[PDB]
Symmetry: C3
Subunit: 249 residues, 3 copies
Amino acid sequence: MNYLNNIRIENPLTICYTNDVVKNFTANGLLSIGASPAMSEAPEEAEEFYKVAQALLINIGTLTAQNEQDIIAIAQTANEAGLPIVFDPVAVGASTYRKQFCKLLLKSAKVSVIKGNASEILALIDLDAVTIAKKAYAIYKTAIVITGKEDVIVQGDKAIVLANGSPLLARVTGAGCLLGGIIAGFLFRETEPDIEALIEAVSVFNIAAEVAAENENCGGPGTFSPLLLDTLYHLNETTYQQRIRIQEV
Amino acid sequence: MNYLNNIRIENPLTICYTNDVVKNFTANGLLSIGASPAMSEAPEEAEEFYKVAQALLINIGTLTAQNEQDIIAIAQTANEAGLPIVFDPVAVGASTYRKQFCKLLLKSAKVSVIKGNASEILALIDLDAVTIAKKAYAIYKTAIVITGKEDVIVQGDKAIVLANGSPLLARVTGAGCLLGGIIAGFLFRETEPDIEALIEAVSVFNIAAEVAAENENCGGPGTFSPLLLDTLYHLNETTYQQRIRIQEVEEN
Amino acid sequence: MNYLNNIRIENPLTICYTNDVVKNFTANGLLSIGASPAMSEAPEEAEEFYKVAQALLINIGTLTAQNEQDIIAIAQTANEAGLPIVFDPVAVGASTYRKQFCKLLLKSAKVSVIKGNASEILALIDLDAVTIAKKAYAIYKTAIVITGKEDVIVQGDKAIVLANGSPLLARVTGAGCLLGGIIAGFLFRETEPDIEALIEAVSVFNIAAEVAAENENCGGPGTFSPLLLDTLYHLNETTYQQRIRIQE
Ligand SMILES: Cc1ncsc1CCO
Ligand SMILES: Cc1ncsc1CCO
Ligand SMILES: Cc1ncsc1CCO
Ligand SMILES: [Mg+2]
Ligand SMILES: [Mg+2]
Ligand SMILES: [Mg+2]
């Protein structure tokens, strides 16, 4: 825990353009680790907000025509402002609508992290999550995080596999959508983030999940979600170091 | 608990076009019973989503001009794909805006379940809940579920009255809006669902509400809502069978 | 606890045009105190709804071009109907977009309460929270509530400072955005509310927060949120009277 300490003290302004199902949970997750979430969606204020922000999350979970042109416009505003973009191509494999939009976005702007599941990342570039992540990294030259049973991170010349979390995370809507926001909270305006910042963001989230699911008062997916926020708020270096399970490839 | 066991194993894709106050809760409810919710609202992807989905929920709780034309278009796309629609005419009796919209929708598309309170269903058709449900069934030839102190379901040649749930359920926003999603999770792509699927859906919800409200850790409407999700996640056959209360059944 | 008793019995219909991060939490907080929330955003039903409503909340937390004209239109419809408006100029200091919009809104319609933090209310008008609140009152001739470490209320010829609540509230998104909706719930269709109603609304919220944070089962910001809703639901006169901390 190096980056988390800085999030708690500096309260980084983390702009979220995310889906309607997960806005509240995203904002709450960010507040629990000390970040300052802002769900600004008006392109008319992007320039002034982005000047002082630390990152931008773009998540297309509920993409519609109302969002398309605005997302492209704000991504260009972010690039111009040097504001790092975390991009979550939610369910891109499920429609030609989403595929065509994600291709247009990644042809129009440079993003700093692409986060998804194996199937989503595979649809972007078209078996192993590591192989998929490496192929995507070669195409976009942008950090890749593939979430799954084990999580994969590829940045620069390094690929890492992480093994933390809980099954109850799959049964909470926008767990993974919140993870995209947490990653944005760890960037501190670095458009080419150190792999160590990405490893800490994913590990903080998954170790908090693991600890929450062990709490005596966790009785299922409903009670888990408040206990995850509490555990993120309290997470300390001892717990982190005892629990982290990482290995290189 | 025949259908709930199948939801947990098959993980049915359940598309929800629902109101902004209850999206998250609705998705979490569906996940807790094993379904796979998707809040897709773009008509441009409805054809590809609906081919593989098991039902669609349409709920007009926060209806605005931005939604009107899109709802009509996706209902038609559902009808063309054979995808069952669960329609929740939220607060239809409260404005001419909502009345006119709901009338237009039901003239444009065939829905598979209409779910509402007695006042909502009465406003649609222009009396006890059973009489209102039967009149609505005669007009739309579509399953009707009327929620209330007792719940009423009319489908095919039967009318049933059910008696489960909790007072805390009225103090949680989108409890009922979640019920419309749960129902959609029980349809398995049947455009004329068996009444037994509707009975199980309403009973699973109300029994889970009852048991959550009895939990020692339930301290009010705030702690109830996480407990309801847990109870839906854990609900078993023994608890279902011990608790279910059918009040009366009429045939034909 | 005069007004809260009446909310529980009368179940006032409280229209909320609020931001997409806090809609569910706002509706739940209102339901917990006995109010009847309705998140109606269609100008086409504003006239019928507002006739029977007790107040309207306007909160610009996620303001976009899709909202601008509609907000102006429904604020005018509220004025015509005699429906009191609570206005929360969320982050107004953060962009010229929001500054321009809030200026236009307050030139187009008369609101009944303006609620914000000190930096928001200062950006609206252009040292301490009391001074800012008095200057805003002199400009808009409208009750002002400034939230902070201590809360400030200015209405008519009185200014009050309150000292209740919990740090945990700042770590729960739309706590403050809920307070706007709770204030609306205490208006009972009074376009010039008594300062006592505003003091009660803010005190109920803050005392509930303080009691929730002391619960043995409150383990942080995540468990706090459900416990705040429970504590609003159960809050009684005895606890209110024991806990209230008011001055000037
Ligand atoms: C976090 C956030 N972003 C826009 S609105 C909102 C809730 C607090 O005002
Ligand atoms: C359930 C759902 N539907 C669109 S976005 C979302 C949350 C998980 O991505
Ligand atoms: C409180 C509320 N307002 C609009 S929709 C909704 C939930 C179901 O009416
Ligand atoms: Mg994803
Ligand atoms: Mg209904
Ligand atoms: Mg404010």
